[PDB]
Each structure stands twice: as structure tokens, then as C-alpha cells.
């Protein structure tokens, strides 16, 4: 039926990817991770991966210790009877050649001359902690499917080191994909005198000091045959970091279709961009359900269905939102798939197949699947990024923000507040290096150790840029997410003090316009409808400004279709606009302030819509559980500050609840065509 | 003094670069190419390059004659005293452990063993003829030195196939840098089976036919020792070609820089960013050479000129353009020495040292000075485009073009037009793969030939990847320059216009406006002055355009300001509006209309002011000596019929004289400081 592999591979790409998130989700919060070689999940790889007190432990299933046990004893009898093993007997890679017989010195100096890393002072030349855990995670549950030949104790020993969060030092660079910094872990398991380890609070450990703070007993391991080649001979550390990114990718790609969705609700987007029609009829699985859950957000919007009881479509960035997406989001599910078929994988050589009597010689240490899912990866983080700074800069412009202020300026004085400026070039200067870092890394290929290892893979280079990539889309989605939740609060004052203008100009028309100027009434209200708020309110009776010209436009206008009535200075149109105009500066421009200042004491006359949409709980968890502040010239806070803010609770994970529950009543379909 | 050559090369980086271009082109034109080893330059290059008839001939210096000989004779007198030489007497490369004496059989194996390129059908796999001229010139250059023991004989018989266009054909790939193509030229002097060539109208030709057209007499050579890998030893085809790419990109440097004061011109730009004190406290040649080169056109200009008669800065694509531009100068200048330098190189192994009576090993076929130029020069042609690029866009928004029509469009209905819209959408895809163009060749080196070749340049891989970005910079070049040559028509219609409304506008105002509305005449005069023609000229008497609006905005003012003379109709501004808009509506559009016509038929009431530009030149080859048409929705031609004018035009070096005749009147320097 599906004698390749083919068939169970494409299960996993079954249901939404909104549901695989949440399932992630959960299996990251879950209080224990048990490896049995074989179900090991991103999401788990990145719980273990944090060192900031969840409390999350492993442990190992015992139904793996017997075939653990047996090919240790096959290596061991195998050693015995004298017979002649690769990496056991033998010497490595392109010096196999070389025999001994003493298997133990073997295996000892094999941890020696791989220990070749460089760490300086300080710690830029180290490997994070965080990826030192997920590649020790991702090696036990190599090691524990039983083919490799090393003993069970040694497994313990590293998963104690997990579980008490004392962590060997790994050199960053060196590998082109593990043997390296794999020989750090094995030369703390041996105690080697270079070998160092960093406590839970930071503090540098010997050996020794390890052994006694994770509560491993028995003194420092003396390497059985083999057994420093299984510890050494895997890709943990590329497909370890691989899916700390993926983790991470995964939630940025669901932000990044809801903050599409709110960007279209801030910017007055038609939610017709979202129609299903228009996916369906393309097929892309990634398309169809980024426009659902846009359209999910939309369709529980005050601000669409405010507009529904009062230029035909939107430029690129909004209504190719989903278009744009969709592959991206296709490329990292299918390579969180192969980065999940890796961290379960025996990547070892050779392989013990007891079953058979025999070592199995092979090239599962290849990481092609890293470098080739990271270097896509990376491409399609760079590609949400580049929608995301178009999206962005379509915000911060009065051209095409349909009304919200330039720069998003928040105070009274739009002379001294620029608002997001700054915050606008530095998303130019994330997105430039994001597509900088959009480069593969696969194709640098060196034939390496004397042309033994002449195709590598380069797995945990591409991670570690993929990481790079992640972090910048991060400042830019913190970035971009407090724009958006600025442009919410301008609606909210935007819609206030229009109100407070109609009123304004309505209630001087019928004083002052009682003659037969009273059927102008109507078209002055409707000078205040359409005129943009942000183009006059900072000084609504300028003379320059558009209101104060429109309205005496409408003035006019009534008084040239006025006919002979005009003759007579008694019902004439024209000598009234004096009148009317000094009434209104009179009264408007205190009225005006009246009003922002009842909105910035919380007594608005007309609550925040975004209190009745979809997408309230990412607007709430910003602007009130982190405390994030509305940005005004008439304070002295940084936009910077305010981003701190979301990027520290972005970077703990606390963004993941507000942004499930926007779509928590979505049932997973898109609309029906309407 | 100078005993590692560092000053004598900084002395060919003294004097401007438009200098150094004027001397090119003169070069280029010269009907005589004489090689001598030494004097080769990229212009000589590039002239014997072309296959256009311009009966461009190449002679050899008789002076060279003693040292090739003396080189020959004692390679040739080696061979007879027995001794062991690389070769000649041993194998090749990595395998030059084998020995033989058979010195005329190993320099035929060696031809017919790098005979390893593919064809295929058609030329898509083939060396472009013009290149394969180009390494031909080059070879002989080295080969005259008198370093390399091959007869004089040889490079005669190359020298009849370049002057009678007879073309051995070579493959397009298969070189690291030159081996295997050089091979090709050799096996046509060999006679080989496969062996071919293409005559002057395309024919191919047997090397027997090849011969006799190219009047070589005595029959196919016979390679005596060392003279087949003299042939193919060398980096002729990557700096061959790197020549060619030189010779243009310098030209359109000049051209960029010219184009970017033109855009000034017809932008309203403001002259002040090319004042000398900006750039000369910066230091950089090539940024303070570009500023003075603008100042020029701007100084001479009838726009400048007029505008001086009667926002503070400009976008960076218009105000940072010498800063941008000079770097990418400074690089193409020292790449193009660097390429002449290798041009004229000794680029052969062994060397034959016959005043020390001994061969030279080395590696003087090593192109790393091709490949290092070929990348750092497409990187500059790519910001060159960047830039270009960024001016066409911000030419073609009438959001920042100062009055110009969006898109440029051209004719009377703005429905039935969108100008450049489609070349707008080409600018931006010609940018992009530009950009993608610009990543480096040299950065994937591989290690090669059974690892003997651990290093090697790729130098005619990246010429080739530069070559292709100059013709898509001369694709963006040729839209850039056909759209400021539109712009340049449009302010001529537009003043042209702009007189008539101001005409029309005072002469119904002085009419039906005599009582105390006498006083409005300068103020609605100034609507005229200070509206943009474009936002209106369609119909400009429509109720919804800005002309009608403001003009009837500036009778209501002064109506309101008139006092208790407005209470009598008699002397009621106000009162005379409608007769004014209905004596305007009369009266404007026919007289707009009239002079659009007058205009069209070469009688301008104004006549076009880029005629008194320094820039004139330009202009008048685009459009009068090309015949390229503005551009109408009235009309049926395309804006690509236009383009390929210049295209073709500027691919046969035509723009070259009017380019420079724009600048003939620079003293070099820039203007005092006032
Ligand atoms: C080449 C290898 C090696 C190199 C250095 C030390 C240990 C092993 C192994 N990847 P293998 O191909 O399994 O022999
Ligand atoms: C390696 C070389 C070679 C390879 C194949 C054919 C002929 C020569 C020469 N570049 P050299 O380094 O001069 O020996």
C-alpha cells in the first residue's frame, strides 16, 4: 500500500494548520516530555529548550531500555571476538584505515581530537544554552530506538543534566553537520579537563561540580567501544535548533494572518479580499485558510459592520495578503514535517541491527533535511516580513491610510509628534537584513575532510540563520503590532470627535441659519461625514484647512442656487456666512477639546469599537495587560519603550493566548459564498 | 621609489573619470589597433569586439618579433638537449607525473583532451562571436611579451581572422578561469575534425574554409612542444570579456550622472544639492565629480534660469544622487584599471625566462583580478539601477513630480492614457533582477581538477553575469531616458497652457469685473500661477477642478471683505460670479484647446525651453535625430516602439556623442562656492 513512506508523510499535512498550532500549543505546555525514540514534537524539543522555570521534565520510557541493552552487548561480544568494526576497531572518516584493538583509548581520543571548538572569553563564540538543551533532548531520543550501541546509563546521566538545567558549554561554530560540539557533551560525561558546564543561575561548573549538582552518581563515564562515536555521529544540534525555530515560525505565521486581518480593519479594507470564492478557485490549501481566518477576524468586526449600516479595492499589501501568505505558511508546515522526521530519525552510523547479527554502514548523519527546511524556511520568513513592512508602511502613510494621521501621530500638535517615523525606518532597516538573511546557506558547500565528507549539509549554519531571521520578524512584528493597536486608538478618537464636530456644526446651522439657508443644513453635516478628521481637527477653524473652506464652499453654493431670494440681505444665503463662521470659531474649537480630553479620561462619548471585535484580545493584552501606552508628543515616552514592552511577552510566549482566542469561535471553515 | 608598482598604478587614477571616458571613446574610434604586450586598452578591446563593420584592423608590433622568437628557439632547443620540462616533456595539472618525449603529440592530446565544452543545437550554449574576438585580441597580447615559446607564425594567423571576421566557435561554459575555450581557438589553428568557425554574415565554415577566407597560408599548424598550452593557458576570455563590460558601464555612468540632472531639470528640482561645499566635505572623488557634472547641466539650464527669474529639499532619489552615484563610479574606474592591468599581463605557465636560460612555474592564469572586478562591478551596476530605478518612480507619482501628469501621460483624456504605467511595472521588474544579479560569482569556488585547482577565480563566469546586468541597466537606461524626454515635452505644454489660462483669466476678469471688483484681478491671476495646469487642463471648467473651485474661493473673499459694498448690488462682488464662470465656461476651454492644437503643429505661443539646456543634445537625438514620438492615448504607438529606438540606438553606441556634447563646455571643475 505504502511501501516507501509516501502515504504517512502526507497524513500529517491533513487538517488546518491553525489546528496543528494549537496542538503545538498545548504539547509545549504539557508538565512532562517522555522520549521513547520515536514521538518527539517540535513543540516539545522547544519546551525542553527553555531555561526559564516551566518546571517541564523528561523522562524515558523503559520500553526502550532492552533494545538499548541489546546491541551495548552485541558492540561489547562483538569487541570480544576479536572481529574487525568501523568506528570501533577501526579509525574515522577518511583515516579508517588505521586498527587497534585497545577500543576504550579508542573511544577516548575520539572525544579529544573532535574536541577542536573555540570559545574565547565571554560568549559569543558558544553555542546558546537553549539550543545546548535541545540538542542533548534530540540525542537521547536518538540513541534510545536502539541501533546505536551505547548504554542506557549514559542516557540518564544526560537526561538528569536536563532535568536539573545543568548544561554543558558547546562551542557555536565547527560543524557543518555534529561531531564537534556533540564531543562537549560526551567530554562532560567523561570529565575531560577542558570540559565546563553552566548552572541554572549561570555560574561555570567543573565536571565534577556538574556530576554532583545533576545528582549523577557513579563518577565520570569511561566510554565503552562505540559509544563516543553514537554520542558524537548525529545531526542533534542543526535539527535541536531547527525546531526551536519552527516552533517559533509557526506562531509568527498565525500573527502574521491575524495582524493582516486588523491591519484591513484599521485601514477601512474591504473584507472582500477575503472572499472565499476568490481562494477556492486558485486550490492553495495555505491561501484558502489564511483568507478564512482574515475573514473569520472581519466578519466579527464593529468596524465592517459599522460601515455596512452607513476606490473599489485596496492595494497590493492588504488584498494580496493572503495570495502572499499562503505558500509561506505551506513552506513551513511541510518543513516542520521534515525537521519532525529527523528528530525522530536514527541518525547514527553504523547501525547496530542485532536482528540481523550485523553493523549496518550508512550516511544517516547527513542533515540535508536541516539545511534544505532551514533554507526554505528563512526565504519564507523573509517573504512575511516583506509583506509585513509593506503593510506597515501603507499605515504610517496619510496617502493611503484612508484618514488615520501621518506617521499614526498621536497629540494635539502634529508639528511636535512624528509619531511612528522612526519606528518606519527601522522596519526598512529589519526588512533589508531580512532579506539579506534570505540567502541560502546550502549551496557553500566545501568538499571537507580530506574529500571523505565531500557533500555536508550544513544543517545548523541554516538554523542558526533561520533563528536570526526569526528574531528580526519578531522586531518587526512588535513593531508593527503596536502601530496597529496606535491606528485602533486613532479610530476610537477619530469617530469621537467627528461626532463632537457634527454636532457643533449642526447646532450653529440652525441658530444662525434658522431664512430659507436652513436647507443647507444638510450639506454642511455631510461636509463634516466626508471630510477626514485627521486633515483639520488640530485646528478644526483654520481658515487653510479643508472644513472651514468646504463648509463655506456649501455656503456659497446654496446661495447661487438661491435665485432673487439672495437680493434681499433678509434671506440672503451669503450675508449670513460671516455670522455663521465667527459663531463657529466661537464655540467648535472649545468644544472640540472638551471632548479629547472627556476620551483621554476614559468618559468618551462613544465607546472603543475595538471592544466588540474578534480581534479585542490582542488589542487588550497590549494596550492593557502589558500596559502598553498610546504614543503622543505631549508625553516624553519612546515609542521603543512601548515596544520593549510586547517584545519581552512576545519573546516569554505570552502573545500565543490573546492570539488563539481572536479566532477561538472560528469552526475551522470559510464563510459560505455570500 | 615605486619597486612594488603601487604608485605607478595610483597614477592611473589621477584625472576625472569623464576624461578618462572622452579618451576611450576617442580610443575606441581609432581605425588601428596595434598590440605590442603592453597598450592594450579596454576601448581597443571593445573596439575589435564589435562584428558592425567599422573595418577596425589589428597589427602586431614588429618589435615583439626578437623575444617571441628567442622564446620559441630555446623552447625548441630544450626539447633537443633531452631535459625535463612541465608541459612539454610531462603530463598536465594534477597529473604531470607522467613523462614522454613525443613533444608534438602531447601539445595534440592536450587540444583535443580540453575540446570538453557542449554545444548542442543553436547558440544558446555558444560563446558570443564578439567575446570570442575579444579573447582573441587578448591572447595575442600576451603571447607577443615574448615569455611563452610560440611561434610568431601563430599569432599572425589569429591576427588574419580577427581582421577578417572569421570567428572560431567556442563554448559558452565549461571555464573557472580559460582552458577549454581556449582550446577552440587552438583547434581551429590545428585544423581539428569538429573544429568550426562563422564567417561575417553568419555561414559556417570547415577550418579549411576558415583558412582560406582568412587568407592563412602553408596549411593547419602543427603545435610544436609548449605552444598548444602557450594557446590555452591564459585568462584571455574572462578579461576579454570584462573589457567589453567596462567599455559600457563607464559610458553609462556618464550617462547616469547626466540623466540624474536631467531628471532635476524636469522635476523643479532643487540645483542646491550639487552646491561644491556638500560634496568637497566629504573627500570622495568620484561623489564630488558627479555634483560638479550636474552643476553643469543645472548651471546652463533655460528651467534653472527661469525659475530663478521669478519644501526646502528634495526625496533622496533626486538630493542623495552624487552620493550614490560616486562610490559605484570610484569601483567601475578601479576595476577597469585592474582589468587593463590584466590585459596586458604575462598571463601564461610555465614563463620562459631566457636571460636567466630557465622556465618560471607560477600562476599567472589565476583570474582572481577578473572575478574580483566582474563582482565588485555588477554590485555598482545594480545600485547604479537601484537609483534609476527610484528617480523614474518618484518622475512618474505625480505625488512628488512637481505638477507632472501620473504616469506622464500625454494625451487630452487622463481616462484614455496611463502613460508610463506599463514601463513602470518593467522599471521595477528590470530593478529586481538586477538586484538579484548583484550577489557574487567568486564566493563559490569549488576545488577542482582532482584537487590540484584548490582555488581558482571563476573570472568569466562573473564577466558573463555583468554583461548582463549592463544590458538590463541599458534597458532601464533607454525607459528612464524616454520618460524624461516625455517630461520634458509635458512642462512645455504645461507653460504653454499655463499662458493661455493666465491670458483667458485676465481677460474676462477685466471685462464683466470693469465696480470695486477691479481688485481681484492679481489675486485671481494668482490662482493661475500657482495651480498645477495638469490637475486641471482635461476640463478646466469643471465645477469639481481645482481652477473653477479657487477662482470662485477667491471672488467669495473678496466679497466678504468688500464691506457695505456688497450690500448694493451694483457693486456686489459676489453678484458677479456666475456672470464670470459663465463668461469663463465660454470662453476657456476653446482657447485651451486652440493653443494645445497650436502647440502640436510647431507653433508654440512658447517656444520649448530645452533648447536653450545644456542637456539640449540629448533631447534632440531622442527625439529628433531617433524620431522617437511622444507618447498619447490619441495615438496607437506603444511605449516599447519607442523604447527600442534608443535601445538599438544606444546598443550601437550612438548616444555617445550627444552625452558628451552635453558636457563639452565643463572645464572639469566645479563652480566657485557663491
Ligand atoms: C566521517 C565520519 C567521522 C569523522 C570524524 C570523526 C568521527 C567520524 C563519520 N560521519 P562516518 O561517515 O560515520 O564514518
Ligand atoms: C593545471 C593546469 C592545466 C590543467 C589542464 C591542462 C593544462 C594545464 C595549468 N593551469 P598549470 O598550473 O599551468 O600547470
Redesign the interface.
Known amino acids: 500500500e505504502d511501501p516507501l513512506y509516501w502515504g504517512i508523510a502526507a497524513e500529517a499535512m491533513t487538517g488546518s494548520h491553525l489546528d496543528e498550532v494549537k496542538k503545538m500549543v498545548a504539547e509545549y505546555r504539557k508538565p512532562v516530555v517522555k522520549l521513547g525514540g520515536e514521538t518527539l514534537t517540535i513543540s516539545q524539543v522547544a519546551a525542553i529548550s527553555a531555561r526559564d522555570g516551566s518546571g517541564v521534565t523528561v523522562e524515558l520510557s523503559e520500553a526502550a531500555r532492552a533494545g538499548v541493552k541489546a546491541s551495548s552487548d552485541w558492540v561489547m561480544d562483538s569487541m570480544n571476538k576479536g572481529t574487525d568494526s568501523y568506528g570501533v576497531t577501526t579509525g574515522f572518516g577518511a583515516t579508517s584505515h588505521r586498527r587497534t584493538k585497545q577500543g576504550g583509548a579508542l573511544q577516548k581520543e575520539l572525544i579529544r581530537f573532535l574536541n577542536a571548538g573555540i570559545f574565547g572569553n565571554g560568549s559569543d563564540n558558544t553555542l546558546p544554552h537553549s539550543a545546548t538543551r535541545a540538542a542533548m533532548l534530540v540525542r537521547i531520543n536518538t540513541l534510545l530506538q536502539g541501533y546505536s550501541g551505547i548504554r542506557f546509563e549514559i542516557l540518564e546521566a544526560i537526561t538528569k543534566f536536563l532535568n536539573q538545567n545543568i548544561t554543558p558549554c558547546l562551542p557555536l561554530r565547527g560543524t557543518i553537520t555534529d561531531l564537534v560540539p556533540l564531543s562537549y557533551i560526551a567530554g562532560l560525561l567523561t570529565g575531560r579537563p577542558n570540559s565546563k558546564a553552566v548552572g541554572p543561575t549561570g555560574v561555570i561548573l567543573s565536571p565534577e561540580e556538574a556530576f554532583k549538582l545533576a545528582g549523577v552518581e557513579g563518577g565520570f563515564f569511561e566510554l565503552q567501544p562505540k559509544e563516543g562515536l553514537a554520542l558524537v555521529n548525529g545531526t542533534a544540534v542543526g535539527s535541536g535548533m531547527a525546531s526551536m525555530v519552527l516552533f517559533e515560525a509557526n506562531i509568527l505565521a498565525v500573527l502574521a494572518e491575524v495582524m493582516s486581518a486588523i491591519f484591513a480593519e484599521v485601514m477601512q479594507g474591504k473584507p472582500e479580499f477575503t472572499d472565499h470564492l476568490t481562494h477556492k478557485l486558485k486550490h492553495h490549501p495555505g491561501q484558502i485558510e489564511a483568507a478564512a481566518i482574515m475573514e473569520h477576524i472581519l466578519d466579527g468586526s464593529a468596524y465592517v459592520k459599522a460601515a455596512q449600516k452607513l476606490p473599489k479595492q485596496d492595494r497590493y499589501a492588504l488584498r494580496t495578503s493572503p495570495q502572499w501568505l499562503g505558500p509561506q505558511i505551506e513552506v513551513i508546515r511541510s518543513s516542520t514535517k521534515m525537521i519532525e522526521r529527523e528528530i525522530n530519525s536514527v541518525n547514527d552510523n553504523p547501525l547496530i541491527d542485532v536482528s540481523r547479527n550485523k553493523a549496518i554502514h550508512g550516511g544517516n548523519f547527513q542533515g540535508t533535511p536541516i539545511g534544505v527546511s532551514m533554507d526554505n524556511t528563512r526565504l519564507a520568513i523573509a517573504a512575511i516580513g516583506k509583506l509585513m513592512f509593506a503593510q506597515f508602511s501603507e499605515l504610517v502613510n496619510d ?1 493611503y491610510n484612508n484618514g488615520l494621521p501621518s506617521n499614526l501621530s498621536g497629540g494635539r500638535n502634529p508639528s511636535l509628534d512624528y509619531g511612528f517615523k522612526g519606528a518606519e525606518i527601522a522596519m526598512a532597516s529589519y526588512c533589508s537584513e531580512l532579506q539579506f538573511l534570505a ?1 541560502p546557506v546550502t ?2 558547500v ?2 571537507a575532510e580530506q ?1 571523505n565528507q565531500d557533500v555536508n549539509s550544513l544543517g545548523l549554519i541554516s538554523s542558526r540563520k533561520t533563528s536570526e531571521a526569526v528574531e528580526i520578524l519578531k522586531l518587526m512584528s512588535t513593531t508593527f503590532l503596536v502601530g496597529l493597536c496606535q491606528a485602533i486608538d486613532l479610530r476610537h478618537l477619530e469617530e469621537n470627535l467627528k461626532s463632537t464636530v457634527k454636532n457643533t456644526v449642526s447646532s450653529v446651522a440652525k441658530r444662525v441659519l434658522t431664512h430659507p439657508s436652513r436647507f443647507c443644513e444638510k450639506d454642511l453635516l455631510r461636509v463634516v461625514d466626508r471630510e477626514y478628521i485627521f486633515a483639520y481637527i488640530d485646528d478644526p477653524c483654520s481658515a487653510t484647512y479643508p472644513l472651514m ?1 468646504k463648509l ?2 456649501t455656503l ?1 453654493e446654496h ?2 442656487k438661491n435665485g432673487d431670494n439672495e ?1 434681499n ?1 433678509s434671506t440672503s444665503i ?1 450675508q449670513k ?2 455670522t455663521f463662521e465667527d459663531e463657529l470659531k466661537a464655540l467648535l474649537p472649545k468644544e472640540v477639546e472638551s471632548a479629547r480630553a472627556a476620551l483621554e479620561s476614559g468618559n468618551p462619548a462613544i465607546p472603543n469599537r475595538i471592544e466588540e471585535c474578534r480581534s479585542y484580545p490582542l488589542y487588550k493584552f497590549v494596550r492593557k495587560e502589558l500596559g502598553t501606552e498610546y504614543l503622543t508628543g505631549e508625553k516624553v515616552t519612546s515609542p521603543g519603550e512601548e515596544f520593549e514592552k510586547v517584545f519581552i511577552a512576545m519573546s516569554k510566549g505570552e502573545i500565543i493566548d490573546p492570539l488563539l482566542e481572536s479566532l477561538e469561535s472560528w469552526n475551522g471553515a470559510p464563510l459560505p459564498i455570500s
Open positions: 496617502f540567502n549551496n557553500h566545501q568538499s574529500h473652506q463655506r464652499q456659497v446661495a447661487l437680493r440681505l451669503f456666512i460671516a
